[PDB]
Amino acid sequence: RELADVLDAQIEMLSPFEAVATRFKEQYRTFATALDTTRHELPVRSIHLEGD
């Protein structure tokens, strides 16, 4: 009885996350790829502008 109660409780703790987890991890992978790109495309070697 008590083991079924605590098991049932962790079922409603765990159940809603599994559906959203796949979309969450795919969009996190895409946005982390975007973060890698924007970190890989910030060239910083300059001072007060001379010429161009």
Q: How far apart are CA 20 and CA 8, in angstroms?
A: 20
Tokens at residue 47, please?
Answer: 């001072």
Q: In the bound complex, what is the minimum distance in angstroms from residue 11's beta carbon to other proteins?
A: 8
Task: Examine residue 12 and tell whether it contacts other proteins (CB under 8 A).
Answer: no
Q: Tokens 């079924």, residue?
A: 4
| Interface pick for other proteins out of 9, 21, 32, 35 (rule CB under 8 A) | 21
Which residue intervals of 1-52 are DSSP H helices? 2-39
How many residues touch other proteins (CB under 8 A)? 9
Residues of the shown chain interacting with other proteins in the complex, contacts defined by CB under 8 A: 1, 4, 7, 10-11, 14-15, 18, 21
